């Protein structure tokens, strides 16, 4: 009996593409999805296959360092017995010279480009040789696939649809940008594969990386860190209406999410672009105007199980391709379970912010993060609001209970200490108390500006920024900022007031503490001693006063107001004394009333009771 000769193999692009939902990708080469049977037809030259005489065996390899242990290589015979969940081949039709075969991949097979080989054996003789190539993708249709999605219309939207909306604008003026993901355009699937093949984990361990491509968690994680360019390229580096041009040129803000979504839909992971809106003198705003806060922010959600985590975390996972991040279940964000991988705290901070006033302790609602979180409706041209998936309603026991799981008691006040006087330099303090068992690391803005009696803010006369302020558990701190006469004199108002403001930022949980306090730089005190009455005043300035003059009156003590000038200028710190004669009109209590006048220091007042 002569050995078999394959004339050709028919990859059945059409019936395969339609059944595997890869029609658009099956224009040239074969593309299929895991955990689902596909078809090949062998045409032999001469006699057909005879199960009794011929044993046929298949071999598939994927990647640059295949192995069986890693799941990136399989050998499997052509037989009637089909083992569920394994690589198998089985005859399903036999005609004149053709042999119809049905192949199955495991639902957890690594995705990627596969070389398919066939060894034809007639016991006493044999011959191996390559049939061709197919690409294996994730299968949201396969009940046993991690990325399974029980709903047909959701499968259409989150994998199959090539145009969507990305939401921009603002929480109150939501704008929907139409986008062309075009995950099934020419060359796109090949680029997604290349992208995978140049990610750092591939350069580090090609074999292991190709194996780990069985995981939608691994694959989504890798994609989040490849859209952006961190000196290693890297698709994007920080107008156009789709992902295709960007990706094609590559091979040679919302854009990151858009490209990520293109790639992940292409690889077969159901995915959606989501937008989060944030909204806003105030130290916070000042501080902003390296993670800041923007009017909106875009990331993606992918759908998968999470066997790598504890049970119950399957479903939507957040991934942020914004300048590796994720995947992290969306329910873990909503639940304040930030210990959950990957990168919980980072996503939590995109949708939470805890802002507290110490204006002396109240809730400051001048910053509001996490509003109208949005994504396109399934199979309709309208916006779905998914804020609820990230956040329990404000003020609920679930919202509060969740805040605790996340946060696992810190307070701030402005302190002065000793007395402050018009003309002197002196410290002000941000006094921070930490009666928790937690250790913190915060940013601190401490700054002062003059303010009128009416509340109008003059120019800055002191600033201290601290990028990393360490707060030990059960401890406190007095952080000094030194206010200089040299720096406030020129910019002082009729008010005589300085406004101290502090901002403490705890970046991880995204907490903010504001303390604010106005301080009054008091005028010198006029000393009035009765011997005749003597009145003196100490120059409080480091400068000399020119044209000093007193004025004294007090009915029951003088029938004449006595305005005496001071000839010489009074030097810094140098006191100035005058005296005038008094002839007590009547008997009881009288009040002497004094005014001091000067070029720099004007309108200072005093009095003394007598008898």
């Amino acid at each position: 009996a002569e050995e078999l000769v394959l004339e050709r193999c028919d990859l059945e692009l059409e019936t395969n593409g339609r059944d595997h939902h890869t029609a658009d990708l099956c224009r040239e080469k074969l593309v299929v999805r895991r955990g689902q049977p596909f078809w090949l037809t062998l045409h032999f030259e001469g006699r057909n296959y005879e199960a009794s005489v011929d044993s046929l065996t298949f071999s598939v390899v994927t990647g640059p360092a295949p192995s069986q242990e890693a799941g990136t290589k399989a050998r499997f015979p052509l037989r009637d017995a089909v083992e569920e969940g394994d690589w198998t081949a089985t005859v399903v039709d036999q005609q004149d010279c053709t042999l119809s075969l049905q192949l199955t991949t495991p639902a957890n097979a690594p995705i990627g480009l596969y070389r398919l080989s066939l060894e034809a054996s007639t016991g006493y003789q044999g011959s191996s040789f390559v049939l061709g190539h197919f690409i294996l993708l994730f299968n949201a249709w396969c009940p046993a696939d991690a990325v399974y999605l029980d709903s047909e219309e959701e499968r259409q939207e989150y994998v199959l649809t090539q145009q969507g909306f990305i939401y921009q604008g603002s929480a109150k003026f939501i704008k929907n940008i139409p986008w062309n993901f075009g995950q099934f355009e020419d060359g796109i699937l090949d680029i997604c594969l290349i992208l995978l093949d140049v990610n750092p984990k591939f350069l580090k361990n090609a074999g292991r990386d190709c194996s780990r491509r069985s995981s939608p968690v691994y694959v989504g994680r890798v994609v989040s860190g490849m859209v952006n360019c961190n000196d290693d390229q890297g698709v994007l580096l920080g107008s156009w209406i789709g992902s295709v041009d960007i990706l094609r040129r590559w091979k040679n803000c919302w854009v990151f999410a858009a490209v990520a979504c293109t790639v992940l839909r292409c690889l077969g992971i159901p995915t959606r672009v989501v937008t989060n809106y944030n909204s806003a003198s105030n130290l916070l705003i000042e501080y902003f105007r390296s993670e800041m806060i923007w009017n909106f922010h875009c990331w993606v959600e992918s759908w998968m199980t999470r066997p790598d985590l504890q049970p119950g975390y399957e479903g939507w996972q957040a991934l942020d391709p914004t300048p590796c991040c994720g995947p992290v279940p969306v329910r873990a964000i909503k639940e304040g379970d930030l210990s959950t991988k990957y990168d919980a705290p980072f996503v939590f901070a995109e949708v939470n912010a805890d802002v507290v006033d110490w204006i002396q302790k109240s809730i400051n609602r001048s910053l509001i993060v996490g509003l109208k979180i949005s994504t396109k409706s399934v199979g309709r041209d309208e916006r779905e609001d998914i804020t609820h998936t990230y956040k329990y309603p404000e003020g609920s026991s679930e919202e509060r209970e969740a805040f605790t799981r996340a946060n696992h008691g810190m307070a701030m006040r402005i302190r002065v200490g000793q007395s402050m006087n018009m003309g002197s330099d002196f410290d002000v303090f941000a006094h921070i108390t930490n009666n928790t068992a937690e250790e913190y690391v915060c940013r601190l803005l401490l700054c002062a500006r003059t303010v009128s009696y009416n509340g109008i803010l003059g120019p800055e006369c002191g600033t201290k920024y601290l990028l990393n302020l360490n707060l030990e558990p059960f401890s406190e701190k007095s952080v000094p900022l030194c206010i200089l006469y040299e720096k406030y004199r020129d910019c002082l108002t009729e008010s005589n007031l300085i406004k101290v403001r502090a901002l403490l930022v705890e970046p991880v949980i995204n907490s903010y503490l504001l303390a604010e306090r106005d301080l009054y730089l008091e005028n010198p005190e006029i000393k009035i001693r009765i011997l005749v009455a003597e009145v003196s005043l100490q120059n409080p300035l480091p400068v000399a006063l020119e044209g000093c003059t007193f004025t004294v009156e007090g009915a029951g003590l003088t029938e004449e107001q006595k305005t005496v000038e001071i000839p010489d200028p009074v030097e810094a710190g140098e006191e100035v004394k005058v005296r005038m004669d008094l002839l007590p009109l009547h008997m009881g209590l009288h009040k002497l009333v004094v005014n001091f006048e000067s070029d720099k220091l004007k309108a200072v007042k005093g009095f003394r009771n007598v008898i």
């Binding site: 921009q168 803000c253 919302w254 944030n278 909204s279 806003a280 916070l284 705003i285 902003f288 105007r289 800041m292 806060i293 923007w294 009017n295 909106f296 922010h297 910053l367």
Partner: peptide, 4 residues
């Protein structure tokens, strides 16, 4: 996209 704009800083708050």
């Amino acid at each position: 996209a704009q800083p708050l």
